[PDB]
Design a protein around this ligand. Structure first.
Ligand code: ADP
Length: 320
């Protein structure tokens, strides 16, 4: 059995899909998955043992000059890669018209997806051969598990979902694994950031613990912030620029993590690492992490400026 997955975007959404592949592999031995995913996250599916082919798309980038010869080429190579194999099942775990019309529609095989009532965009259901009813009021990880389960003919296990990507890194963990913690300070919205002042205070509180802290960064401004947070603390290091798989390895070796509501926080949960995610304008109950050792820390009045470094540590301490 070879199945095709359409779940391209939002690092988090991609990551939350992993537990479903694990259920499938355990219930259907020998099952392999191909995965159509946004180029920026293409490495994530390769970490799962049940994944074979990873087929990258770049919808947003392609949308800006859709008929240019350069893109036309990429798009042609994409469609050919997508239509190369004939699948026993195509599972659209995205439920958006855009990817359903551009990806799902073109795949060879019975197409499964969420029905009119439960798809993110109802009209997306019209593009599937099998429309499944997946209840909206449950975690995204569970919903996708239910989807894979109903699509492949097996009952969803009652055990907690297992991302099963950690194993990919445990074979080659950083030498200093467990000697440090990782602080994920970078995200996309101003109000989702925990004020720098507070990050430093938290860093400061750990000065005499003996722990080391590593700060990742994706873009120049983030590195600058990273340099400002480490300024003065010898036990704090600013990581070099690296790929997702690179920062994945570092996370895998972190004893624990403190982070803002962002994709890398979801990755950290996928690697089963203790993590304290701090929320402000976004709600964890709706968009929170999945994974057991995932600890939610709400800011007073949902305003991170009101979250003290003291409370975050007084949190890490009482969530040990
Ligand atoms: N390889 C990387 N190393 C460090 N940070 C990264 C890397 N890739 C993405 N990011 C961070 O993820 C964020 C952008 O996307 P995402 O994580 O999904 O965030 P959000 O959920 O806030 O939209 C940025 O803050 C970006 O720097």
């Amino acid at each position: 059995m070879r199945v095709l997955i359409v779940k391209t975007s939002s690092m988090g959404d991609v990551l939350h899909t992993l537990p479903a592949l694990t259920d499938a592999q355990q219930a259907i031995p020998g099952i392999k998955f191909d995965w159509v995913v946004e180029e920026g996250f293409a490495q994530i599916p390769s970490w799962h043992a049940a994944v074979e082919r990873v087929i990258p798309v770049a919808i947003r980038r392609w949308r800006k000059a859709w008929f240019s010869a350069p893109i036309k080429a990429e798009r042609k190579a994409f469609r050919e890669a997508l239509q190369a194999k004939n699948y026993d099942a195509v599972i659209d775990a995205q439920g958006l018209v855009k990817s359903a019309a551009l990806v799902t529609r073109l795949a060879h095989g019975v197409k499964h997806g969420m029905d009119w009532q439960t798809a993110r965009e109802p009209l997306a259901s019209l593009f599937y051969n099998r429309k499944h009813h997946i209840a909206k009021q449950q975690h995204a990880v569970e919903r996708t598990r239910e989807l894979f389960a109903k699509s492949l003919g097996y009952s969803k296990p009652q055990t907690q979902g297992d991302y099963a990507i950690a194993q990919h890194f445990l074979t080659n963990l950083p030498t200093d694994a467990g000697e440090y913690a990782v602080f994920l300070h970078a995200t996309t919205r101003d109000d989702k950031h925990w004020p720098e002042e507070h990050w430093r205070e938290l860093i400061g509180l750990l000065a005499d613990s003996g722990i080391r802290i590593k700060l990742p960064w994706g873009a120049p401004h983030e590195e600058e912030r990273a340099k400002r947070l480490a300024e003065g603390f010898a036990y704090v290091e600013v990581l070099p620029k690296m790929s997702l798989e690179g920062v994945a390895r570092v996370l895998a070796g972190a004893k624990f993590v403190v982070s803002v509501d962002t994709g890398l926080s979801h990755l950290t949960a996928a690697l089963d690492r203790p993590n304290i995610t701090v929320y402000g304008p976004t709600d964890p109950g709706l968009i929170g992490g999945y994974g057991k050792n995932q600890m939610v820390c709400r800011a007073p009045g949902n305003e991170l400026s009101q979250l003290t470094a003291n409370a975050v540590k007084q949190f890490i301490e009482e969530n040990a």
